[PDB]
């Protein structure tokens, strides 16, 4: 009996399904897709909720009429949904076709006020999402940054109230940064930094300074300020004093920086999940964050670029058991990514280590007791990628008898397109979900959701970095996975 060993598998739909004028054009097509998916034996899918096209005409002008649409679609299509709320800006970069800003209405206090932005050593500001610190500051008409986000997601559930109840919607992915994830936006891509730059320190918006000084004044230290041999975005960690081997991340004043750094962000998650869990409250559904994959500079001591997502991760420090722990409480979970990708794959000069990385953070919400899903990181077709995934998916292999030891609580891959459903592409993917499934159909009633509970105390930030050290090793992952693609 290997029912236990079973890993749903979701798929993340267009970043177009629905229009940027938020209309939902493309319904044909969806189905269509949709048609060779449930062919395939598919979960559900997952998407986009855009803040920017919801809540586009002026503050709590909620229109959701476009997002109705689509999920009567997928309902009409025996899917279940995995509903992100995006508080983020979609595209932006060079080339990018699908281009959603949050709401302008948000944006023009930026004219008055720009520290709303997350901002760089040079005074860039990164308009893609608000700054934590302005999590609690009321900034717009009135309301701060987590009262937009509380608001939206109890519009959310009033208006999509028909969809939890028929166990359509599943699980409510909770956007925390830019890219929807809960970190510093310390790599910009069209703005000045290219793979595989050792990042930024994006915290310099006049709220996060105030912190840090208050911070700074809390422990005896007035004096103290942002480090400032820390180079900039497209160095290596040998450029810098900083990041060097035995270099200032390791000092007393080093320590406490990257301890506030990382610290904000964590701190960040947490209030805005508990607003999450109080309006999704007796809902079957699954709460989650997604965290970044910085997997390059891995290999390194000062792990810069993690550093500078604001993953205070080292050879002795757990960065990631300190986000599950504060996750812990709310009975959140982590969806990761990089779940496709292989050492051997990475460039040699990025010093990557996704496979470790992976087993990681894997292993630190395993520890943590909780779900920890999985995405891939980049477009990938090929047998090779998924046979990585389905390592990662049961890493233990099957159980025979019973479940196995450790699993992913569900696997999303990125994303639909026509380029997915057709030719040896498709046949690729199908045999996939038959080894995620354990070679066993589809069972719609797998993973039963009680109804939400509350979230359990309030823990401070001391307790959340108890879970930082000792650092301990990974459970073991086999090196192949015993179900290949074939
Ligand atoms: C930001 C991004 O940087 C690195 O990705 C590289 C690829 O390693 C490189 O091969 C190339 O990727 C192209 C890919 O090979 C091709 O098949 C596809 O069709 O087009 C790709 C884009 O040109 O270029 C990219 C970019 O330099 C890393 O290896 C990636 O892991 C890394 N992704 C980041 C970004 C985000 C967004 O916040 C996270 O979701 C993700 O976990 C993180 O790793």
Same mark, same amino acid.
């Given at each position: 009996?290997?029912? $236990? ?38 979960? $559900? ?21 476009? @997002? ?64 934590? $610190? ?16 509380? %608001? ?12 939890? %109840? ?66 900039? @975005? ?10 060097? %081997? ?73 960065? @990631? ?121 589809? %069972? ?43």
């Amino acid at each position: 009996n290997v029912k $236990g060993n079973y890993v749903q598998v979701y798929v993340m739909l267009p970043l177009d399904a629905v229009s940027v004028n938020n209309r939902f054009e493309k319904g044909d097509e969806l189905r269509a897709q949709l048609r060779k998916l449930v062919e395939a034996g598919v979960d $559900g899918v997952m998407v986009d909720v855009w803040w920017g096209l919801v809540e586009g005409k002026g503050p709590k002008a909620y229109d959701w009429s476009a @997002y109705k649409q689509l999920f009567e679609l997928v309902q009409k299509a025996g899917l279940k949904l995995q509903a992100i709320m995006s508080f983020h800006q979609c595209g932006g970069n060079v080339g990018d076709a699908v281009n959603i800003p949050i709401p302008q209405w948000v944006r023009d206090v930026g004219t008055r006020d720009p520290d709303i932005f997350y901002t760089d050593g040079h005074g860039t500001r990164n308009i893609e999402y608000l700054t934590l $610190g302005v999590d609690n500051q009321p900034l717009f008409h009135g309301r701060s940054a987590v009262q937009m986000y509380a %608001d939206y997601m109890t519009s959310f559930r009033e208006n999509m109230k028909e969809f939890l %109840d028929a166990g359509v919607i599943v699980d409510i992915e909770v956007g925390l940064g830019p890219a929807g994830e809960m970190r510093y936006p310390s790599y910009p891509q069209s703005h000045g930094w290219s793979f595989p730059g050792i990042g930024e320190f994006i915290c310099y918006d006049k709220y996060l300074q105030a912190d840090f000084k208050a911070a700074a004044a809390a422990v005896g230290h007035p004096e103290w300020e942002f480090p400032n041999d820390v180079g900039q @975005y497209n160095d290596t960690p040998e450029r810098t004093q900083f990041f060097r %081997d035995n270099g200032t991340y390791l000092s007393e004043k080093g320590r406490f920086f990257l301890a506030w750094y990382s610290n904000n962000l964590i701190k960040h998650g947490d209030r805005i999940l508990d607003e999450a869990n109080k309006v999704f409250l007796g809902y079957k559904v699954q709460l989650a964050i997604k965290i970044s994959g910085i997997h390059w500079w891995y290999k390194v001591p000062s792990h810069a670029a993690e550093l500078t997502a604001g993953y205070y991760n080292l050879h002795d420090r757990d960065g @990631y058991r300190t986000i599950a722990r504060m996750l812990k409480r709310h009975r959140a979970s982590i969806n990761f990514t990089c779940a496709e990708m292989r050492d051997s794959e990475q460039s040699s000069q990025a010093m990557s280590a996704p496979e470790e990385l992976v087993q990681q953070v894997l292993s630190a919400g395993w520890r943590e007791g909780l779900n920890v899903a999985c995405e891939n990181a980049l477009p990938r077709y090929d047998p090779t990628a998924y046979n990585t995934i389905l390592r990662n998916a049961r890493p233990h292999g099957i159980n025979q008898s019973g479940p196995p030891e450790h699993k992913l609580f569900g696997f999303t891959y990125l994303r639909l397109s026509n380029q997915l459903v057709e030719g040896q592409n498709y046949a690729n993917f199908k045999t996939f979900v038959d080894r995620m499934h354990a070679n066993l159909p589809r %069972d719609p009633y797998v993973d039963p959701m009680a109804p939400l509970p509350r979230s359990g105390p309030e823990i401070s930030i001391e307790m959340i970095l108890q879970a930082a050290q000792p650092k301990l090793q990974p459970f073991p992952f086999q090196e192949h996975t015993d179900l290949p693609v074939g």
